[PDB]
Each structure stands twice: as C-alpha cells, then as structure tokens.
Amino acid sequence: TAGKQVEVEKENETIQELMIALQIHSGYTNISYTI
C-alpha cells in the first residue's frame, strides 16, 4: 500500500525525535545532524 509509505515516514519521525532526546539528556557531546 502507498499509504504504508506514510507509516515509515512516521517512524522515521519518531526515531529522529527520540535520538535528540536521548542525546541531550544523556549528556552526549557529539550532537549533530544525521541523515
């Protein structure tokens, strides 16, 4: 289904927002912009 490409786009979004929060609140010091 071409609507389940709208689902990987949504887990694409949460992994991204998840890492930012792990990195910041675990004192990571190599925070960048990953593709």
């Binding site: 609140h25 675990s26 990571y28 925070i31």
Partner: protein, 240 residues
Amino acid sequence: SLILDDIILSLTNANERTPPQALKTTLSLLYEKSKQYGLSSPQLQALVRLLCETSIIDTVTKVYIVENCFLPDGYLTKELLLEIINHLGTPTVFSRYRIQTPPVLQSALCKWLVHVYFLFPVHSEREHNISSSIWLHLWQFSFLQKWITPLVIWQATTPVDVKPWKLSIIKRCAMHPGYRDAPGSATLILQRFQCLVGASSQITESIITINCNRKTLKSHRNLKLDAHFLSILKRILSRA
C-alpha cells in the same frame, strides 16, 4: 585577521603554571584586536570551546570575553552552534566524566546567541526540524529559559513547527513547581504559536490554565539588549 590566531592558539596552550601576567597580556591583546578586526567564524569555534573546557580563566572573565569579544565577521557557521550546543546542559549519570561548563557561562552563551540571531545560517528544512526540537528540549533547563525562549520563538515560523507534543512539554514546565519564571516564558512561546497557527483549542486553553499577572508577561516580553555590543558589531560587519 591572522593575528587573532596566535592569540587564540596561545590561550589554548595556557594552563596552570603559566605566568599570570603573561596571560593578562594575551587576554588584553584578545580584547583589543577582536574589537577591531572582529572574529572569523572558525576562530570563533575554537574560542568558544576553550571558554567551555578550560579552568585557567576566571568564569566571570569568561563571561566578559563573550560579552565583549564574540564579534563575528559574517554569517554564523552551523558547526558553531553545534559546538555551543554540545556544551550546554547538566552532568548526568551517563556523563559524569564530562567537562561541564559553569551554568552562568552557559546562559551567557545563549544571551549571546540572541544578540546575533540575525547571523544564523540557513537550515535545510530537515535541519530546521532538528534545531527546533533541540532548543525546546534545552529550554527546560531552568537556568537557560530566559534566553532560550527567544530562540525557540524566533525559530517558530511555519505552522508545521507547532505540534501537540511541543505543547505539553511547554505546559508541563509552566505548571511545574521548582520552576519560577517558566509560566512567563511559556505563555510567550504559546502566544507565538497562537499568533502563528490561528485558533487551535489546545493552545488557547493551556494559556488560561497558566494564569500570569499580565505584568510578569510585560517584564518577559521586553529584553534589554546591550546596545554597545551591536554598535561595535555593525562596525565590524560593515568593513569586510
């Protein structure tokens, strides 16, 4: 100019054991030529990281260097905000071995970023999404709120930026005891979301749940911005 690198590269080698009058020379030499040629963005990156990792400069003189010599000669680099970002926060159970940087120095770095907001570089939109959430997360550090909230606000441009999960983060923090100013800073961010996406029931009723005297909000909306610093900066940016 090239002089501002033997300067900067020297401070890098300084430590305990250096003739402290040798130091004060190099600092004054820094205060001097920074006001003249201004600071080249890669130099500025090397400066800010020594400012956040070395012990051999009084912290209140660190603040002074940010308040009187952080004068960029153009647009800021993205690798520069990452260098600042990677030095903000609190020591955590995964990060106890970390060199952590005095909070006052931290917030002063932020206040400085507010002054040079117009020099921020262009972000790809994926990059803008990231940057928008970092500052919101950072916003929660009680001692960065005063100066983060302008950055989280000014980055709020399209109604894509304002989403529900950012709202509770904000609402949690406003209502949260153990924060003093957060209701002021929070309503602000909210009003900018209101002023941006339009109606949205969630936002408008959040603002109600946070009652602010209508006069802390007027002490929060107006910032003093140190005109002397932007004076010197306009001069630098004019020249080359």
